[PDB]
């Protein structure tokens, strides 16, 4: 609608990819905090994380809650299929 205020320091397209970065980051961190309180101390899955091995808080959400963003080389997923990524989606669709 030509009314969004870009972030001072980048352009308009570089601002859209930055605003959605903090939205998906808080979405995958808020759901992970709710699963931490549900699991009790009797569960053997938490004992592997509290002990300090190959597992932390991010490994719990990727198997129960939500995985997260799969960035490539820091940047997000580019376009290489006629300004798209997969033919299953419609053109000009910036969905997560």
């Amino acid at each position: 609608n030509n009314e969004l205020e870009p972030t001072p320091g980048n352009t308009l397209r570089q601002t859209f990819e930055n605003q959605v970065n903090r939205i998906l980051n808080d979405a995958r961190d808020k759901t992970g905090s709710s699963a931490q309180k549900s699991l009790s101390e009797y569960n053997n899955f938490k004992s592997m994380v509290v002990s300090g091995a190959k597992g932390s808080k991010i490994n719990i959400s990727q198997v129960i809650a939500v995985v997260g963003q799969q960035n490539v080389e820091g940047k997000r997923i580019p376009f290489g299929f006629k300004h798209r990524t997969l033919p299953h989606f419609i053109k000009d669709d910036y969905g997560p």
């Binding site: 030509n2 969004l4 308009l12 397209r13 859209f16 300004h83 419609i90 053109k91 000009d92 669709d93």
Partner: protein, 125 residues
Amino acid sequence: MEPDGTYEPGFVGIRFCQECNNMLYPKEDKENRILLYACRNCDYQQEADNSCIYVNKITHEVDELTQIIADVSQDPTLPRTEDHPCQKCGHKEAVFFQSHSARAEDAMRLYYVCTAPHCGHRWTE
């Protein structure tokens, strides 16, 4: 002489001769103090008509809107909208898209293009 008028004197693209069919180079006649045009292979000459013969640093106006035809709605790979008040007639099912070019256009404003017959127009909202 006020900051309101635009700049569009009418730049001539290219002119064709009647014997060699080549582009004429601008020259000056010191006997009449005028502007003439002549090539190098022949001796054809003619008078001028304007003064703007060169331009540098392009891409400033809205270029993504031009260089396109009204056949972009026949491709079913584009979504539709509910906008029905048009500038010519009144039909819904308009096609909206960005620009899709090299610079990809900094403006993310959609370009509403109708698909009803008897139109051939374009605008933006």
